[PDB]
Design a protein around this ligand. Structure first.
Ligand SMILES: Cc1cc2nc3c(=O)[nH]c(=O)nc-3n(C[C@H](O)[C@H](O)[C@H](O)COP(=O)(O)OP(=O)(O)OC[C@H]3O[C@@H](n4cnc5c(N)ncnc54)[C@H](O)[C@@H]3O)c2cc1C
Ligand SMILES: Cc1cc2nc3c(=O)[nH]c(=O)nc-3n(C[C@H](O)[C@H](O)[C@H](O)COP(=O)(O)OP(=O)(O)OC[C@H]3O[C@@H](n4cnc5c(N)ncnc54)[C@H](O)[C@@H]3O)c2cc1C
Lengths: 504, 508, 126
């Protein structure tokens, strides 16, 4: 006879373990089990210590927060830290991106980021009278101000801008019916759009997704002077700590426990897990769209809510890290007008090559690596660039570097491109390499974007509890206002928990 | 009791109707039914007459053949024409692409195609010492010669090149394990690659697909001086005529008959179509990968051959046509050094804008439209460009223009870009517009490409009859040597038919 | 100093150019020069004087004199009456020749060197 539990939570990412923790506190007498199909808690948070670099943490998934905007993740870090020992405290460090000396290897030209404003004739993009001599940030924020006048006023919050975008029209059409790429193309040159792709480092951010959602999202990060923090001991400590709390409080976690499908019979969820049936009175799916899509053929209730599930598009992201006996990139700085050497050593170098983005990985205190065993985020790339790298394939953390080891041919092509980007013919050998392709099942993407014609403000409220008189719940980054962020996952966990507590 | 037939053929594209025609001739006493889920025969061949232009045919799908290379489609046109009346004959016309006066609007600069070889300083790409002053064709063919020495020798056929690629290695690795984009990146600059994307008109052709398959495929079209023919009365006449022949010969066609799934029980195929079960002793799926993927959840036999089905990737293609009261583009030609005017009027203009490719649509005799109601293939685009157009959405032929009508906002953005491309502030209003997005189910793509690490020469022979002692057959463009072509669909139909005739009993 | 290298194909022929009428002019006979230590590279003729246009082919990779010889030297660790193998070139010398040949011909990839031989005529007793 079948195992019977009160609350089944499927998905061991941050929203799943956060939800488990909250629900066990709210309902201490309920039998709550969280099921993860993979071999570890964390989902798209994957923190690994590089071999030979005990004071670094490579972030194959999520790596930083906007501490000034993202109140939920900042508050959760405090909620975790008030329970952890002094030894275990989560500590943040300042996370650099655009230092002026960093390289932009664009259309075969070696630029420094300061060339974008200081030497427009050198920038090999035919930018217009208004665009010329500006960063991608400046060009896109100004484009957004032309499209939604008043939106870039710095006195407004993300929430006030999201509201303005919900009521805004463009040539008589509601913003939620229009595409971000379509609208940007009305106000910037094709060359400004390509410059913004290339030098901004991302293909997926400027795609034709929902303009009403894209505009406030863009303004709060990639626009107005984004300020970031990283995690001394890895972002993944957040979900690992919440899992630990849930288990201390009498919750149960099952790893290697894939939900294969579920039926709703006799006012119960019948979950098929490892060819066994488990009965639960409530089911919470803490998982993105692709994870819901994979369950749909064996889960009749998901077949009833296709238009809700289909309201976002998964956006693959790819990261690969490489390590070296020395930070050889530091030799690709320059000599200033007073004869002082300016080292290349922190933040991001960009390129239109498939590498797209290279980070000089900081020490766990935020300081640059100036000597000894050092690390690149060799490539952080999206869009059509992922196919290039894919074709070359043949307290405590809970995953090792070795479990994500990169294949040799992929590493050799990375080494070739890093050399062309930095304009050197010799670099010390790669010692270690790891990678993650977040386009892979069950994730479908690193982030998920609202589709054109969707009203996010309706879908996000509906999909947390999508069928009336049915104890089915959904949470995570995918159907949030904070897409591409842990903040988004916590936002929808909070909306879902509020509904769950009102109903059950 | 369930309806019982001998041969079920599912898919009313070229390979399906060709297979139906051949099999009914071979087995006149068998009950052969062809099922098409859509409302018409043709699949990715969709020919429509524009309103106001009775002497034109817009090709929303396939539009031309390489008459010198593609012996199967040339022979099929003869096989069709030897049965058609003089009135109905299929007639071909010469189909232009690169005229030297045509525009390349690249990185904000207005070029003519002759600038690529005549004025390299004007071409806004930082091409290397060896690349500079050349077309994309020249750069990529030379890259391919560096990668597989001897392959571009003009004495070789596509078949001899495919063989060389099967035995070739690159740095000790078999070619079939390597990616086309990865290898091109070893021999051309990033700027030459982007120049080849932009000016060559296509994103999907230069993706990281199987190098062993991509190289000979590239050489036979986009490389060595590609020469093309169009169809006076539409490519779609080919599958329509074969359907007609099949029915005259006693074959049956059911339209609006979507196969929902099939089971194999008691040595029969049980086909679920419109909530009815039909029994068939042989089942032929004349349909691409995505169509097989959509059947897989309700078809246990397809679940057994996932690695075969998964051996290609669908490649979306998008086309939208616009019409005007006059061919306004002809005013965007130039005055030669002797004061003669050179009109812009035939072949293709290219851009890095989302339009990507614009064709000055020929009359049904191949001649340019020089006055009166005229047509563009306004945009023929692929890769990330399709998302841009998609987000703006809110003898006889057998489909109308109006069934594919384009929405206003899509048309207004096309008009904006056409104006920027041609460097004009005014054009006469669009009268009519039609489009097709071939990324949509059940097609998944306009073409399908062999994946890296696949041995095409094994999969193409295996997948036509993928389970031993099981009368399941597959044909079409998707698992062919001629991907992106009617030729490929006929190639695998012929491989499939040969296997079918060797294996199967001729009885009822 | 002379050093010869062989390849499965005459890859240099791909470093010609397209003339003003669209005809390809192959790089395939005589000498390419440089101020790099290679100094002189010959596209080695067949025994009838005709260029090698396909199959196993050979460069006089470097024919160099003066201070250039020290650069190559520091990388060291009918019938005819001597064999190629008796003058075999060491790997590190060959890898540096390959690097320079690539920079000279403006290519990032060439098929691997199959065989290499050299002679330094500054040596005793000459
Ligand atoms: C490359 C990358 C960079 C990012 N950068 C940042 C950043 O810097 N800062 C930031 O804040 N955010 C970032 N993010 C986003 C952040 O990582 C995510 O938004 C968040 O981690 C997702 O949490 P979630 O609760 O939605 O679920 P997920 O993390 O998606 O977890 C869902 C879980 O459900 C499981 N599952 C699915 N189906 C089943 C099933 N049938 N049975 C059992 N288990 C199942 C999966 O195995 C998975 O573990 C990044 C993401 C990626 C990929
Ligand atoms: C934009 C575009 C441009 C092209 N250009 C050219 C060119 O110039 N020249 C050229 O030679 N080729 C060209 N091609 C390719 C050519 O059109 C195709 O390769 C060829 O027509 C495909 O034939 P097929 O037999 O594989 O089937 P398809 O045409 O793919 O037809 C398959 C059929 O199966 C049906 N089907 C699928 N699932 C089911 C089901 N469950 N039940 C019932 N029916 C089902 C579909 O409705 C469809 O009609 C082009 C393609 C496109 C899209």
């Amino acid at each position: 006879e079948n195992e019977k539990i009160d609350i089944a939570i499927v998905g061991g990412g941050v929203s799943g373990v956060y939800s488990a923790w909250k629900l066990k506190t709210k309902y201490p007498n309920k039998k709550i089990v969280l099921f993860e199909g993979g071999d570890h808690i964390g989902g798209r948070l994957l923190s690994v210590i590089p071999p030979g670099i005990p004071n670094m943490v490579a972030e194959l998934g999520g790596m930083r927060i906007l501490e000034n905007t993202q109140k939920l993740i900042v508050k959760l870090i405090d909620d975790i830290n008030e329970k952890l020992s002094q030894e275990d405290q989560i500590e943040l460090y300042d996370f650099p991106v655009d230092q002026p000396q960093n390289i932009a290897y664009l259309r075969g030209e070696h630029l420094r980021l300061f060339d974008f404003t200081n030497d427009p004739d050198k920038v090999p993009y035919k930018l217009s009278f208004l665009e010329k001599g500006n960063t991608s940030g400046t060009i896109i924020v100004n484009a957004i101000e032309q499209l939604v006048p008043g939106i870039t006023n710095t006195d407004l919050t993300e929430e006030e801008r999201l509201k303005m975008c919900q009521e805004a029209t463009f040539e008589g059409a509601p913003l939620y019916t229009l595409g971000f790429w379509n609208l940007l193309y009305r106000v910037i040159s094709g060359e400004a759009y390509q410059f913004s792709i290339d030098s901004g480092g991302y293909n997926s951010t400027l795609v034709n997704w929902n303009a009403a959602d894209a505009i406030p999202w863009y303004l709060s990060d990639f626009g107005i002077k984004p300020v970031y923090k990283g995690f001394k001991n890895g972002f993944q400590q957040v979900p690992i700590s919440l899992a630990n709390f849930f288990e201390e409080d009498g919750g149960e976690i099952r790893l290697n426990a894939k939900l294969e499908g579920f039926e709703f019979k006799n006012n119960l969820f019948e979950l098929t897990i490892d060819g066994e049936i488990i009965e639960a009175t409530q089911l919470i799916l803490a998982m993105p769209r692709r994870s819901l899509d994979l369950l749909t053929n064996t889960s009749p209730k998901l077949q009833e809510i296709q238009s809700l599930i289909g309201s976002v598009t998964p956006r693959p992201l790819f990261k690969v890290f490489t390590t070296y006996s020395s930070p050889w990139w530091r030799n690709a700085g320059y000599t200033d007008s007073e004869g002082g050497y300016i080292p290349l050593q922190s933040g991001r170098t960009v390129t239109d090559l498939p590498i797209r983005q290279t980070y000089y990985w900081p020490k766990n205190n935020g300081q640059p690596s100036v000597s000894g065993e050092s690390m690149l985020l060799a490539s952080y790339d999206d869009g059509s660039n992922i196919g290039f790298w894919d074709g070359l394939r043949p307290k405590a953390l809970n995953q090792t570097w070795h479990q994500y080891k990169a294949p040799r041919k992929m590493v050799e092509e990375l080494s070739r491109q890093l050399k062309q980007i930095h304009d050197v013919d010799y670099t010390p050998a790669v010692k270690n390499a790891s990678f993650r392709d977040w386009g892979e099942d069950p994730f479908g993407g690193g982030w998920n974007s609202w589709n054109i014609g969707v009203k996010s403000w309706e879908v996000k409220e509906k999909i947390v509890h999508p069928i009336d008189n049915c104890s089915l719940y959904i949470c995570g980054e995918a159907y949030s206002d904070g897409q591409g962020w842990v903040e988004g996952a916590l936002q929808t966990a909070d909306i879902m928990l509020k509904k769950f507590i009102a109903v059950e």
